[model samples]
Target: QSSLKTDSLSLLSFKTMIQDDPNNILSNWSPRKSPCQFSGVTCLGGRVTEINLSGSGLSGIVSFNAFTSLDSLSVLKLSENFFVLNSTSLLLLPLTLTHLELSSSGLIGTLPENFFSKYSNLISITLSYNNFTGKLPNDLFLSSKKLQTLDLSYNNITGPISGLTIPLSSCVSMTYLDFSGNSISGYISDSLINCTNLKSLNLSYNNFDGQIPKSFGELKLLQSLDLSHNRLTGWIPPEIGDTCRSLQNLRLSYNNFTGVIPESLSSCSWLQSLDLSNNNISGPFPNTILRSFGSLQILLLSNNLISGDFPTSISACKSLRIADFSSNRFSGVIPPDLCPGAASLEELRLPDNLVTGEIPPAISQCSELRTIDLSLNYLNGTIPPEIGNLQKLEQFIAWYNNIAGEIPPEIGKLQNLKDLILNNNQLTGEIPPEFFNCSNIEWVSFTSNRLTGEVPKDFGILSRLAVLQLGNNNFTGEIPPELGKCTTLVWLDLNTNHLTGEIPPRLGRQPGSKALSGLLSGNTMAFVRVGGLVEFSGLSLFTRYQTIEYLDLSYNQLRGKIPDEIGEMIALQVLELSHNQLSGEIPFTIGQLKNLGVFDASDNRLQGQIPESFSNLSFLVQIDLSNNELTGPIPQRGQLSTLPATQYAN
Candidate 1:
């Protein structure tokens, strides 16, 4: 009879509190049935134990007064619901609750000072990715002695973390802690020593500086430690590696760490990932670095001052999958046999170093290789076509070297090729049409080459192409109009070639013809035609004379009116239109460019009153308007205004 009386009260509370239930889920409750058997309630020993009503489209401020009646409640997960609570009201919850997950539940405002003071049995709390601000309550962890997992990441919690003097020793079960992506700063105190059982700790991308405390070595059970992208400096304490033997992933990159890699790091036998890149560490690559790490898979040591040849001993690690030794002073031909025995090698990067000699064809033996960057070295000789045998190859960068010979047609076999940079080389012969077969190509630069002939018409078919640079090449042909079809093309530089053709007007068309948006919106407006009026108003006046600084259109067969718009470029530092068949009145607007330092329109058919505005050319240091049909008395003002009387006599 008592059990029946308790169930009847729960039914009355559910009906009176729930405001909107379009799903009719509330019908699952009964007056005589135990609330435990309800669709979203769990009971233990005839008392409510858990209430999981997450994602049922429940909306309204959570009224704890209704739940306060259930004294036996231990777990309440109301995530993904819309609950609005102020500081004063949140502290009035049932103190018996242990595990509370209110993530993404529209919870707002700073948590109350004693938010967790009542729930001493709380073991886990996740309040990440919310609008909660202010320093975490001083007694946050102290109040919940049983907390094993605490994730307050992606919050606006500011102020020095040292201010939170939580009794960490009492929370011995704490294992997982993440305070990443916050504005918390100041030196990390040894207070972490209290959480002796911590297994995973992530404090990356913060402003924590000063040497890592030696006490960090005390976390003997730590498995993953990420302190990257912080302002920490000084040599990494060797004792860290000596103590944290259970560490599997250690990332200390993007810091100011220096000195030789600690030899004691070999103690981390379970280490699977080690990143020490982008630091000032120097010295020859350590030989026994991976001798004890049998489970190691990824090792990155790029962008450092570490010198000496490739460590051949790395080949002994049969389980290695990814290895990056690029942007270092490692010299000599890459050890062909290095990692030769390991079949799992996927990425081998060794770029921007003094390493010399041709790439050994033995590299093709690593069939699982997907990325190979050996560019910016003294590597010479023809690129071995055997490289194409690596069917999974994606990025092949071998530019700015003395490499010569025709690009092997075999490269076309790399169907997944995305970026191919082979510029500034001695490569000759016509570019293979097969080169255009890679539909995924996004960035291709072959500038400063000896290749000649028309670009493949199929080149425009590369729909993903965004950057195409073929300048200073021997190619002789008209610019293909098909290039305009590459809607993704944003940067196109084909200058300094023998190509002859008028600029394709279609090149300025809107991509996909959807009403202009983003940066392209301005370009669309410039080309749009309203009635018969050409509206170039949206054209970026800044870029119209971008090449004006160099001014080398002197000897081309360019013909057009010196558009008055050219004068709008107040940054005109140099103007050279000499020897062109350009015939038109020298737009009086030219004088508007007060910054014109050099003006050479010498051998053109330009004729007009050198507009009185020319008097404003105060910064004109060199003016060569000679050989033009220009007629008028030169204004006798400004530095260039005064010409020799004899020159005017001509």
Candidate 2:
């Protein structure tokens, strides 16, 4: 048969093996049709040169032996399919193939020992996201002088990076090599440096241990290198900066690397991102290197022992986007010109540090800022009114500081603000009426402050509000019935306040019958320091506050009968109403809280028998009915009976 005819018959045989093709990708691969007319098939001079059937929903393994007759096949892509691998049949593929891509193809079975050595014309091979197991054969990298890209990431393959028959003198053509997300272990071999033209190398998410080879810096054209999420240890070799002047992105986080960041990194002035967080590195911030990195965008040095003042020269790097230095020992005042020149700054986090000084009013110059965190510090002084200029601000976290003075009224201008956490401080005065203009606000906490005023009746306008905590403050007046208008409100805490009022039946109307009416039902009462930890609690596993889970009105002067409307909060988990003057009997509707875990109503004037429906609370763990005029026997079933007598004292 002629070469074109032979190729047509070969493809027809291959198509017969595909047991399923939901996408009908092989509909045109009939024997009567010209091979050049086949879907995903490319022909050059009437000869089949490429078969690109990637993401066609094709299934089943076809013998590659059928394609050997084509002779001219050079590129084959079968990615994102359900094809299983038959290693022996794979070896029969034509040696003329130069580029092969089979990523995310559900491939199985071990690779053949001559996988790469036999394909002299191969330039790239990607078999990532497969289930191939067993050791990589020693001859895997033996030949193929023209190969440039080899990506075997996200596989179950094992074995070291060293072996006999590993002479890689022909690796001169390699430009990219990725062996990440695998079980591969052992030290990186210095011999692999023979690929001097390599521009990107990723060995992250592996079991590789020991120091990175200093020889890797000799790859003069290297731009990106990631060795994160590994067990690699030892000092970061300065040679990485001593050479490799073209480096742009270097990620070495989540390792055991020790010692300070080498000063030589100043040589990489074009660096865009550098993440050395979660290591044991010590010493002062690399002040000398900051001036050279004008292009640096992401500088994450958190979770290390690095100390000393955050340099003012940081403003010299005008392109900074995110600078996170949390969980370190850094001290000294924040630079007054922190963001005057860096217009691209988006996230600035320095929580859990010794940093002392007021937040910079000039920071509003960074118009692109979305998140700002300065919690757990000694910072003081009123919030800068200039903060209202940042229209893009989303999260403004400054909790656990000594900041006093009324929250700036200018804050209301940020229509994009979502989080306004300022708890545990000396803030006074009523919340600014302008604050109610922040219609997108979700989580607000003004707890443990000296603020005095009635809870805002205008809170009804915050349609997306989820958690509103004003506990442990000196606010007075009745709970606002307008709060029920906040349909998405989930957690409400008015605890330990001087407020005097009857519990609003409307409190239960929200989140319960309103917020969750459309969808399926889904902190310490200490927030984790950083802003991201807002979702770190076990409750975050569910959708964002789909149901009412926490309501704390304890230690207040709330009185009158417990509202029967409380039953509407079916998803309540913890209800704190202790030390209040609340009168009348405990509402029988309380039993409707099937998920309630802790119910405290001690030091109240409640009366009548404990409800029989209490037994329905199968998940209740703690119940307190002490210091009250409550009349009935504690339910002798479920978790209620298991509690100590003090809980039922009356």
Candidate 3:
């Protein structure tokens, strides 16, 4: 009867604490009525056993003392509401209480010291997505034998936990641990693996740095392990392959891992997703990386030093969907059965490798293929017109290769193609007029090639095009004003070509906006051996041109007043106009570029005082104005004053 009285007074106290209840969930909470009938209330043998008020719009200070009334209470979950409280004394917790969940509640303050020691019976504790801060006291959790789950994700806790160490006996029963999206740092120690019962563990999106604990492979029952987006380094433990035979999902990507992959991983035959991308891992690419996982669906091993010819025999991984092998040292011919057992494959990225030989004609097998990037390799021979068989192909990149012969006309069949980045190869023959029929192409970078053909006169049909680089090619034609309709055109480079005509201002400038980053001057010196937009991204760094960043048509036969529209490139960091026939007064509007750093107009017919506004270029580091008709008393202050007389001395 005393247990009933304690439970009754506790219920009444909890009711008085919450004066506002819109759901009427607790309006019937009367001492006269059985507490078991109350909404979200459960009682056992006339004693309140649990109180779950999640998402009930309840508001009140959670007094641990109120819960002590029922000596038999085991669960108290009141998450998803505003519960105001702070570190008081948790000196005496209900001896029988084992579970406490308070996630997404408007709770504040740091975890109180000595708080958990009083309730070592707790089996689970969830305080995620709150404003809690400060270091988690280690000793407070070492004594909870019944504690299994400890999730503190999405919180702002900060610490360099000298190291997360624990004795095996203290948490032998622990499982399901998560500390993701937190600020926890320091090397991960093997203390976590001591919990022999751990299954799902997530330490992602944290500041954990240093080599991953090698002992992690000892967890035989581990199902899912995520350690991405951290500063983890060192070779992945081979024991993981030899021990974690039941492991399914392992994500150790975006780290500083090194050494060759452990062939022992072939032991984890049940593995489905493995991502080791963006690391320093090196050596003979393990053929087991793919052959072992028959059920694998997503595999990303990009950006590593993995060098080696792929395994000769292909294992049928019909469940594979996405595979990336880019930016590695892997060599040898493309495997005929790359997607062997997988017809549902969608992405195949083999760029930036030493892989040679013709792209296997068998590649046309994947009807669902969406992307195929074979750029920056030693690939040769004609691009198979058979490539157009993938009706859903969106991006086809194979630049900077030894590929020769005519680009197959069959490519025009890919109506869904968006980016056709095939530049810097030895391909000859006119760009098939059929190629121009693929009006949906957004970016064409067929520069630095031997292809001869007039850029189709109706080139403006690709209304969605942004960057068009056809420079250093054998093409004849007048600048197309139809390009003016391509409102998204931000970069247009047509230098060192056989075309002759006044530069169309429409294609030249987008007006009132910055269409270019850097412009060039006399004596062109660079065309990185790499092809496609990858080269353009490299140009963005050419001379980084000080605080801003290159444009080059200066050595070309561009004969016109250096178009006044040049000033539209407000972000223009480097301006080189040497050896050009451009004749005109430098636009005073040049002053609008507050970020311009390098300006070169040497050997030109320009005649005018360097714009007085040039002084406004406070970031200007260098200027070349010699060998030109430019006659001006140089500005005496700002960046211009720092240049050597060689820039202007005639």
Candidate 4:
């Protein structure tokens, strides 16, 4: 058969198994016999040269025998398909093939041993985002003067290669090599120094190891180097970088290294970028370079060994933008005047330290700040209102600290704030009324603290509020009826606190702006949080307030009618005096509470009929009502009729 019929038929075999074709990527290839008439197919000199079938929603494996007929095939790209090779017998690939891209297709099994060694004239090949596992071949590219780029990233390809350790001399002509996202373990041979033409080398997200071979210093033309997220040990060698005048991007982050940094870097003070994060270096915290490297813009020196207070020398970088000193053994009170000299710093990630004392007010100089994470520290004392000066701040996280006292109104000034995560601390006083101004707050987590006072009633101020975790605190006050304003609440955790009052009718009923009264029309409440603990318990995620559970709203000074509105809580499991001061007969509407397990309205000024509604509470296991001036006969029914007369005794 001629190449036209052979190659055209081979391409058709892939079309038979397509399960989805949303893009209609294949059309004329059907009754049409010519490959040139197919979508995404290329023909040169009347012969099939390329078979591009990427993201065609095509499924099933590409049969190996399909390509044998297309003898002149060079660019065989069958990416993003559910393709796999199940045959154990290895087969040879076409010699003319130079660019073979099989990325993101479910390709299983190994590529043949001489897959690369036999294709010496190949220019580029990408087997990334696949499941091909084997000792990736390198000999073919090593001897080829034509091949320049090879990307085997995000695959199951094993081996970082050991042995007389084939030197990089074989791939001397290579300019780019990426082995990212793989299980390639063991040493990166020292011979890589021979690739003088290499411009970008990224072996990140792998199991590779050993101190980067010292020969790395010999590559004169190297420009970008990334050996991050590996198992590298030993001190960072300065010799290799000593001669690096052309290197622009260097990322050694996510590796466990030791010792102080390089000495040769002291002269390159004009360097604007320094990202030596998470290398786990030991010894004294280096401070001498701050003044000399005055041009430094991004200073991320986390993952170190210094057990001292923060280095105040960072103030020397008048041009700094991002200053992060996170995940270190740094201890002691933070030194003062740690603000950037440029007053233009943006991010400050100083979490996971043994930080003590309060944040200094003088640091307010950084008005351009966006993110500040000072979480997981021993820092005590009230968060200085000084942080309010950072109006541009987006995320202010101080999760586990010794901070105590009220959340001041100064926090309201942060209108742009996205997250307010300050849980598990000693912060007290009611959530300030000023909080109603922060419309952008997303997560208001103050869980496990000593906070008190009623939750702010202006839920309208936080229309975007999603998580309101004030549980395990000393919070008091009734659920705000205005809570209908914040309709985005999905997970509302307010179980353990001094919260009182009946569940807000808006919160205890079906979702949506139907309850908010005077707001937009699209409000809706759908809670994923269902249960909690104690006679003292939960309330909305604003919109989900309708999902009422156990409530202990006594002595809150609540002087409203038991708000007969209390019966609106259809999901009420345990109702504990929906707040104090409720007068008038408890609404017979309380009759609809068929799901109520425990009911109490004792100290309350409640009167009127002991509705036969109590008779329908067949599930009532616990009941309490002592002290009220209730006068009606307890016409009991269901399981509640069996209650001790003291259960209703006054």
Error at 48, model 2, angstroms: 1.3
Native-vs-model 1 lDDT? 0.71
Write the residue-wise lDDT of candidate 1 on 1-650 in tens digits: 23435534754575566676655556777665667677778877777778877666666655566666566678877666655655445565566778877766666676667766566777887766666776667766665567888887776766667666657666688898888877778887678877888899988877788888888888998998888888888888887875546898899999888887887787787898999999887877676866776677898888988777767666666667888877888877766675355567888887888887777777777778888787787777787788777778788887777888888887888788888888888888888877777878888888788888876667767767767777667777665768656645545656456655443433311223222234553443333333443444533443333322223335444555677755655655666656556677777788887888777676667776667787888887776765667787677767655654433322
C-alpha TM-scores of all predictions: 0.71, 0.92, 0.76, 0.69
For model 3, residues 345-430, the per-residue Cα lDDT tens digits are 78888899998998877788888889989999999888888888888988989999988988788888888888988888888888
lDDT of 2 by residue, 1-650 (tens): 35886898889888888999998989888877898999999999889999998998799876787788989899999899987766566688888899999888777877778778788899998989987787787767678588999898999888887563445577878889998999888887787677878889998998889998898878789999999988889889989885548999899999998888888888889899999999988877778788898999999998988888977878877899999988888889889887777778899998898988888899998889999999998998889999999999999998999999998999999999999999999999998999989989999999899999889899887778889999999999999988877778878999999888798886623532334432232232124543633433242343442466789989999889999888778878999899989888778888888899999999999988889788889998887878999775777878888888888886
Which pairs clash in model 2? none
Model 3, global lDDT: 0.74
Pairing residues by index, what is the TM-score of model 4? 0.69
* Best model number under lDDT: 2
lDDT of 4: 0.71
Among the numbered candidates, top TM-score falls to 2
CA shift at 354, candidate 3, in angstroms?
2.6
Task: Give the 10-residue window scoring lowest on summed lDDT in candidate 4.
Answer: 531-540
Candidate 4 per-residue C-alpha lDDT over 380-444 given as tens digits, one digit per residue, 9 for 90 to 100: 87877877888898898989989887787898889899898999888877778777678788778
Q: Which pairs clash (backbone N, Cα, C closer than 3 Å) in model 3? A: 518-550, 518-551, 519-550, 519-551, 520-551, 520-552, 520-576, 521-576, 521-577, 522-578
